[PDB]
Protein backbone atom coordinates (compact mmCIF):
# COMPACT_ATOMS: atom_id res chain seq x y z
CA UNK A 1 0.00 0.00 0.00
CA UNK A 2 1.31 3.49 -1.01
CA UNK A 3 0.51 6.93 0.46
CA UNK A 4 -0.64 9.76 -1.86
CA UNK A 5 -2.33 11.66 1.06
CA UNK A 6 -0.11 14.77 0.46
CA UNK A 7 -1.85 15.39 -2.93
CA UNK A 8 -5.33 15.23 -1.27
CA UNK A 9 -4.50 18.19 1.06
CA UNK A 10 -6.69 16.75 3.89
CA UNK A 11 -9.61 15.82 1.53
CA UNK A 12 -10.94 12.31 2.30
CA UNK A 13 -10.19 9.98 -0.61
CA UNK A 14 -8.18 7.19 -2.21
CA UNK A 15 -6.33 6.34 -5.42
CA UNK A 16 -5.53 3.15 -7.37
CA UNK A 17 -3.11 2.76 -10.34
CA UNK A 18 -2.76 -0.54 -12.26
CA UNK A 19 0.12 -1.54 -14.60
CA UNK A 20 -1.06 -4.35 -16.96
CA UNK A 21 2.67 -5.16 -17.63
CA UNK A 22 3.63 -6.47 -14.12
CA UNK A 23 -0.06 -6.81 -12.98
CA UNK A 24 0.77 -4.59 -9.94
CA UNK A 25 -1.70 -2.24 -8.21
CA UNK A 26 -0.52 0.94 -6.42
CA UNK A 27 -3.26 1.43 -3.76
CA UNK A 28 -3.79 4.45 -1.49
CA UNK A 29 -6.69 3.83 1.01
CA UNK A 30 -7.60 0.16 0.32
CA UNK A 31 -11.01 0.23 2.11
CA UNK A 32 -12.16 3.23 0.02
CA UNK A 33 -10.78 1.83 -3.29
CA UNK A 34 -12.89 -1.36 -2.72
CA UNK A 35 -16.13 0.53 -1.84
CA UNK A 36 -18.80 0.72 -4.59
CA UNK A 37 -20.31 4.17 -5.27
CA UNK A 38 -22.34 5.79 -8.08
CA UNK A 39 -19.95 6.35 -11.03
CA UNK A 40 -21.77 9.61 -11.90
CA UNK A 41 -20.42 11.07 -15.21
CA UNK A 42 -17.44 8.62 -15.31
CA UNK A 43 -20.14 6.30 -16.81
CA UNK A 44 -19.75 8.39 -20.03
CA UNK A 45 -16.61 6.22 -20.74
CA UNK A 46 -18.91 3.16 -21.15
CA UNK A 47 -22.10 4.90 -22.46
CA UNK A 48 -19.96 6.40 -25.32
CA UNK A 49 -18.91 2.83 -26.35
CA UNK A 50 -22.51 1.50 -26.02
CA UNK A 51 -23.75 4.38 -28.24
CA UNK A 52 -21.05 3.63 -30.86
CA UNK A 53 -21.66 -0.18 -30.76
CA UNK A 54 -25.44 0.38 -31.29
CA UNK A 55 -25.05 3.08 -34.01
CA UNK A 56 -26.75 5.82 -31.91
CA UNK A 57 -23.52 7.83 -32.49
CA UNK A 58 -20.69 7.16 -35.00
CA UNK A 59 -17.89 9.75 -34.48
CA UNK A 60 -16.43 12.57 -32.33
CA UNK A 61 -18.72 14.97 -34.32
CA UNK A 62 -21.97 12.96 -33.70
CA UNK A 63 -24.91 15.13 -32.45
CA UNK A 64 -28.08 13.95 -30.64
CA UNK A 65 -30.40 16.90 -31.44
CA UNK A 66 -30.94 19.88 -29.06
CA UNK A 67 -34.59 20.67 -28.07
CA UNK A 68 -33.75 24.27 -26.97
CA UNK A 69 -33.99 23.50 -23.22
CA UNK A 70 -32.14 26.26 -21.32
CA UNK A 71 -29.89 24.45 -18.79
CA UNK A 72 -28.08 26.04 -15.82
CA UNK A 73 -24.76 24.91 -17.42
CA UNK A 74 -24.73 27.21 -20.49
CA UNK A 75 -22.09 24.88 -22.12
CA UNK A 76 -25.03 22.40 -22.59
CA UNK A 77 -27.25 24.93 -24.43
CA UNK A 78 -26.51 23.87 -28.06
CA UNK A 79 -26.42 20.82 -30.39
CA UNK A 80 -22.98 19.77 -29.09
CA UNK A 81 -20.82 16.98 -30.56
CA UNK A 82 -19.76 13.75 -28.78
CA UNK A 83 -16.33 15.31 -27.92
CA UNK A 84 -18.02 18.42 -26.41
CA UNK A 85 -20.66 16.34 -24.53
CA UNK A 86 -17.87 14.20 -23.01
CA UNK A 87 -15.73 17.22 -21.96
CA UNK A 88 -18.76 19.22 -20.61
CA UNK A 89 -20.27 16.05 -18.91
CA UNK A 90 -23.51 16.79 -20.82
CA UNK A 91 -26.15 14.64 -19.06
CA UNK A 92 -28.98 15.46 -21.55
CA UNK A 93 -26.83 14.16 -24.49
CA UNK A 94 -25.97 10.86 -22.75
CA UNK A 95 -29.56 10.29 -21.41
CA UNK A 96 -31.02 10.77 -24.95
CA UNK A 97 -28.27 8.39 -26.24
CA UNK A 98 -28.91 5.59 -23.66
CA UNK A 99 -32.72 6.01 -24.10
CA UNK A 100 -32.25 4.72 -27.70
CA UNK A 101 -30.73 1.40 -26.37
CA UNK A 102 -32.84 -1.54 -25.00
CA UNK A 103 -32.24 -2.13 -21.26
CA UNK A 104 -31.42 -5.78 -22.14
CA UNK A 105 -28.52 -4.63 -24.39
CA UNK A 106 -27.14 -2.34 -21.64
CA UNK A 107 -27.55 -5.14 -19.03
CA UNK A 108 -25.70 -7.72 -21.23
CA UNK A 109 -22.85 -5.23 -21.92
CA UNK A 110 -22.40 -4.24 -18.23
CA UNK A 111 -22.59 -7.91 -17.08
CA UNK A 112 -19.91 -8.88 -19.67
CA UNK A 113 -17.75 -5.86 -18.57
CA UNK A 114 -18.38 -6.81 -14.87
CA UNK A 115 -19.31 -3.13 -14.29
CA UNK A 116 -19.81 -3.21 -10.48
CA UNK A 117 -23.35 -4.16 -9.39
CA UNK A 118 -24.57 -3.81 -13.05
CA UNK A 119 -27.82 -2.44 -11.54
CA UNK A 120 -29.78 -0.32 -14.10
CA UNK A 121 -33.16 -0.98 -12.37
CA UNK A 122 -33.68 2.77 -11.66
CA UNK A 123 -33.39 3.70 -15.38
CA UNK A 124 -34.76 7.27 -15.01
CA UNK A 125 -32.48 7.91 -11.98
CA UNK A 126 -33.38 9.51 -8.63
CA UNK A 127 -36.31 11.86 -9.44
CA UNK A 128 -36.54 12.78 -5.69
CA UNK A 129 -33.79 15.40 -6.42
CA UNK A 130 -36.39 17.43 -8.46
CA UNK A 131 -34.09 17.45 -11.59
CA UNK A 132 -36.70 15.67 -13.80
CA UNK A 133 -35.08 14.36 -17.05
CA UNK A 134 -31.51 15.39 -15.86
CA UNK A 135 -31.19 12.05 -14.08
CA UNK A 136 -30.28 8.45 -14.89
CA UNK A 137 -29.33 5.09 -13.35
CA UNK A 138 -25.61 6.17 -13.38
CA UNK A 139 -26.17 9.48 -11.42
CA UNK A 140 -26.49 8.85 -7.60
CA UNK A 141 -28.95 6.04 -8.41
CA UNK A 142 -28.96 2.21 -8.73
CA UNK A 143 -25.61 1.64 -10.57
CA UNK A 144 -22.56 1.38 -8.28
CA UNK A 145 -18.87 0.50 -8.93
CA UNK A 146 -15.68 0.66 -6.82
CA UNK A 147 -12.54 2.59 -7.90
CA UNK A 148 -10.73 -0.80 -8.27
CA UNK A 149 -13.57 -2.11 -10.52
CA UNK A 150 -13.27 1.14 -12.59
CA UNK A 151 -9.54 0.50 -13.29
CA UNK A 152 -10.23 -3.25 -14.03
CA UNK A 153 -12.91 -2.08 -16.53
CA UNK A 154 -10.55 0.56 -18.11
CA UNK A 155 -7.77 -2.08 -18.49
CA UNK A 156 -10.13 -4.61 -20.22
CA UNK A 157 -11.47 -1.90 -22.61
CA UNK A 158 -8.11 -0.37 -23.62
CA UNK A 159 -6.13 -3.69 -23.67
CA UNK A 160 -8.71 -5.06 -26.20
CA UNK A 161 -10.27 -7.70 -23.87
CA UNK A 162 -13.93 -6.56 -24.43
CA UNK A 163 -16.44 -7.05 -27.31
CA UNK A 164 -16.21 -3.31 -28.24
CA UNK A 165 -14.68 -2.57 -31.71
CA UNK A 166 -11.09 -1.18 -31.67
CA UNK A 167 -12.33 1.66 -33.96
CA UNK A 168 -14.86 2.79 -31.26
CA UNK A 169 -12.29 2.47 -28.42
CA UNK A 170 -9.97 4.74 -30.52
CA UNK A 171 -12.77 7.37 -30.74
CA UNK A 172 -13.14 7.21 -26.92
CA UNK A 173 -9.33 7.55 -26.38
CA UNK A 174 -9.35 10.71 -28.57
CA UNK A 175 -12.18 12.46 -26.61
CA UNK A 176 -10.62 11.35 -23.21
CA UNK A 177 -7.24 13.05 -23.85
CA UNK A 178 -6.51 15.95 -21.42
CA UNK A 179 -3.75 18.65 -21.69
CA UNK A 180 -1.38 18.40 -18.63
CA UNK A 181 1.42 20.78 -19.84
CA UNK A 182 3.86 17.83 -20.34
CA UNK A 183 4.30 16.32 -23.86
CA UNK A 184 6.45 13.54 -22.21
CA UNK A 185 3.24 11.92 -20.81
CA UNK A 186 -0.27 11.32 -22.22
CA UNK A 187 -3.17 11.55 -19.68
CA UNK A 188 -6.75 10.45 -20.53
CA UNK A 189 -9.73 10.66 -18.19
CA UNK A 190 -13.34 11.51 -17.29
CA UNK A 191 -14.57 13.48 -14.25
CA UNK A 192 -17.61 12.59 -12.15
CA UNK A 193 -19.51 14.71 -9.60
CA UNK A 194 -22.42 13.71 -7.37
CA UNK A 195 -23.65 14.02 -3.77
CA UNK A 196 -24.78 10.90 -1.88
CA UNK A 197 -27.78 12.41 0.05
CA UNK A 198 -28.37 9.24 2.13
CA UNK A 199 -24.76 9.23 3.52
CA UNK A 200 -24.13 13.04 3.17
CA UNK A 201 -20.82 12.64 1.24
CA UNK A 202 -19.64 13.65 -2.25
CA UNK A 203 -18.86 11.18 -5.04
CA UNK A 204 -15.98 13.04 -6.77
CA UNK A 205 -14.12 11.06 -9.44
CA UNK A 206 -11.29 11.20 -11.99
CA UNK A 207 -10.93 7.89 -13.91
CA UNK A 208 -8.62 7.21 -16.86
CA UNK A 209 -5.10 6.17 -17.90
CA UNK A 210 -1.51 7.52 -18.11
CA UNK A 211 0.84 6.59 -21.00
CA UNK A 212 4.52 7.31 -20.12
CA UNK A 213 7.55 6.11 -22.19
CA UNK A 214 7.12 2.29 -22.09
CA UNK A 215 4.41 2.00 -19.38
CA UNK A 216 0.59 2.37 -19.21
CA UNK A 217 -1.28 2.84 -15.88
CA UNK A 218 -5.09 2.66 -15.51
CA UNK A 219 -6.21 4.81 -12.58
CA UNK A 220 -9.18 5.83 -10.45
CA UNK A 221 -9.01 8.80 -8.02
CA UNK A 222 -12.01 9.12 -5.64
CA UNK A 223 -13.10 11.52 -2.86
CA UNK A 224 -15.92 10.81 -0.35
CA UNK A 225 -15.37 14.16 1.49
CA UNK A 226 -18.21 15.84 3.46
CA UNK A 227 -17.48 19.20 1.71
CA UNK A 228 -19.70 19.77 -1.40
CA UNK A 229 -16.90 22.00 -2.84
CA UNK A 230 -15.07 18.68 -3.65
CA UNK A 231 -16.09 17.92 -7.27
CA UNK A 232 -14.76 15.80 -10.16
CA UNK A 233 -12.70 18.80 -11.41
CA UNK A 234 -11.02 19.11 -7.95
CA UNK A 235 -10.24 15.34 -7.91
CA UNK A 236 -8.84 15.76 -11.47
CA UNK A 237 -6.42 18.41 -10.04
CA UNK A 238 -5.41 15.93 -7.28
CA UNK A 239 -4.93 13.17 -9.94
CA UNK A 240 -2.60 15.40 -12.06
CA UNK A 241 -0.55 16.25 -8.90
CA UNK A 242 -0.29 12.50 -8.01
CA UNK A 243 0.88 11.79 -11.61
CA UNK A 244 3.45 14.66 -11.47
CA UNK A 245 4.92 13.55 -8.09
CA UNK A 246 4.73 9.72 -8.23
CA UNK A 247 4.51 8.78 -11.98
CA UNK A 248 7.16 11.08 -13.58
CA UNK A 249 10.93 10.53 -14.26
CL1 LIG B 1 3.90 6.19 -1.53
Author numbering: 40 to 288
Q: Any passages from the paper?
A:
Clostridioides difficile causes life-threatening gastrointestinal infections. Herein, we report 30 X-ray structures from a structure genomics pipeline spanning 13 years, representing 10.2% of the X-ray structures for this important pathogen. The Center for Structural Biology of Infectious Diseases (CSBID, formerly the Center for Structural Genomics of Infectious Diseases) implemented a structural biology pipeline starting in 2010 through paired efforts with systems biology, bioinformatics, and other research specialists in C. difficile pathogenesis. This project ultimately involved 335 proteins linked with pathogenesis, metabolism, and antimicrobial resistance.
The structures presented here are part of the C. difficile 630, R20291, and Y384 sets nominated at CSBID. The overall success of structure determination for C. difficile in both CSBID pipelines was 7%, with a total of 23 unique structures and eight variants or ligand-bound proteins determined.
